[PDB]
Design an enzyme around this catalytic site. Structure first.
Site, mmCIF file in Angstrom:
data_model
loop_
_atom_site.group_PDB
_atom_site.id
_atom_site.type_symbol
_atom_site.label_atom_id
_atom_site.label_comp_id
_atom_site.label_asym_id
_atom_site.label_seq_id
_atom_site.Cartn_x
_atom_site.Cartn_y
_atom_site.Cartn_z
ATOM 1 N N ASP A 184 -0.034 -7.555 1.824
ATOM 2 C CA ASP A 184 0.451 -6.176 1.829
ATOM 3 C C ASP A 184 1.976 -6.160 1.989
ATOM 4 O O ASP A 184 2.533 -5.872 3.054
ATOM 5 C CB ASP A 184 -0.269 -5.375 2.912
ATOM 6 C CG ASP A 184 0.021 -3.883 2.837
ATOM 7 O OD1 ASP A 184 0.495 -3.397 1.789
ATOM 8 O OD2 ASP A 184 -0.241 -3.190 3.834
ATOM 9 N N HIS A 225 0.811 -1.212 0.000
ATOM 10 C CA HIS A 225 0.000 0.000 0.000
ATOM 11 C C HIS A 225 0.843 1.260 0.000
ATOM 12 O O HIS A 225 0.300 2.351 -0.190
ATOM 13 C CB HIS A 225 -1.087 -0.010 1.089
ATOM 14 C CG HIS A 225 -0.642 0.424 2.448
ATOM 15 N ND1 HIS A 225 -0.301 -0.462 3.446
ATOM 16 C CD2 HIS A 225 -0.512 1.664 2.983
ATOM 17 C CE1 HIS A 225 0.034 0.213 4.537
ATOM 18 N NE2 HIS A 225 -0.095 1.503 4.281
ATOM 19 N N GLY A 268 1.981 6.890 8.673
ATOM 20 C CA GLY A 268 3.341 7.256 8.415
ATOM 21 C C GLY A 268 4.344 6.203 8.838
ATOM 22 O O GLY A 268 5.501 6.257 8.409
ATOM 23 N N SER A 281 3.561 3.020 8.233
ATOM 24 C CA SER A 281 3.280 1.964 7.267
ATOM 25 C C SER A 281 4.523 1.567 6.494
ATOM 26 O O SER A 281 5.357 2.402 6.129
ATOM 27 C CB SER A 281 2.244 2.469 6.266
ATOM 28 O OG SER A 281 0.995 2.790 6.886
ATOM 29 N N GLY A 282 4.637 0.269 6.249
ATOM 30 C CA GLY A 282 5.758 -0.289 5.546
ATOM 31 C C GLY A 282 6.941 -0.630 6.419
ATOM 32 O O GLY A 282 7.832 -1.361 5.971
#
Ligand SMILES: [Ca+2]
Length: 223
Positions: free
Chosen positions: A84, A40, A175, A177-178
């Site tokens: 994801d 994402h 923020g 994320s990942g």
């Protein structure tokens, strides 16, 4: 990260910032030329920033390297956030040392109750917005699949796990994320999603990296 602590400069040496003119997602360095993040977080024109602490000040340990190729998992579903995960190849190899280092992939999945480290430059408030410039850290346990599924009925696949605190107050947020979830020196999770941040009975949900090790290794070997 809500309810976390300041990590300290370059204490999380595998943490990357993905930059498209500004920080927009985290990631993890898994070897000198490959980063893993969340699907994402996909976009064109990514610069990978290694060795960061303050993302707004050049402090001297940074390496800025453009991506040459991004590979979103073949079965990523943006509606459910199943699968994801994405891989990013760097145009050139990073220079690895004590402050910039890769994180090992897992050979086994981690069990509920294991304590992990989650890090990022995401929002630090559960109501409102305050984005830190230095890396924040949170220690949190993997929750049981039964508790995870009870918090998010109908939404948790075998490729996800929950980590955090059912009482709220401490979580990953926008923020982050990942970014990495590291347990016992291995990358076990990727910050993926949740219902708000740090809410009661709504822990963070993370991509379950141990399910993807074969795809990662095969993809790297041929790209
Ligand atoms: Ca910096």
């Amino acid at each position: 990260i809500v309810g976390g602590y300041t990590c300290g400069a370059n204490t999380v040496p595998y943490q990357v910032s993905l930059n498209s003119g500004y920080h927009f997602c985290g990631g993890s360095l898994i070897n000198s030329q490959w980063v893993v993040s969340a699907a994402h977080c996909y976009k064109s024109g990514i610069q990978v920033r290694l060795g960061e602490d303050n993302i707004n000040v050049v402090e001297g340990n940074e390496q800025f390297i453009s991506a040459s190729k991004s590979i979103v998992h073949p079965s990523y579903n943006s509606n459910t956030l199943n699968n994801d995960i994405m891989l990013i190849k760097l145009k050139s190899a990073a220079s690895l040392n004590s402050r910039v280092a890769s994180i090992s992939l897992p050979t086994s999945c981690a069990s509920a109750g294991t304590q992990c480290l989650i890090s990022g430059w995401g929002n630090t408030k559960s109501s409102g917005t305050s984005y830190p410039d230095v890396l924040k850290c949170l220690k949190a346990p993997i929750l049981s699949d039964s508790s995870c599924k009870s918090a998010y009925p109908g939404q948790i696949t075998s490729n996800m796990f929950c980590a955090g605190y059912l009482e709220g107050g401490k979580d990953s947020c926008q923020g982050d994320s990942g970014g990495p979830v590291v347990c016992s020196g291995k990358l076990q999770g990727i910050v993926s999603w949740g219902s708000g941040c740090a809410q009661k009975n709504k822990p963070g949900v993370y991509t379950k990296v141990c399910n993807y090790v074969s795809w990662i290794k095969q993809t790297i070997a041929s790209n």
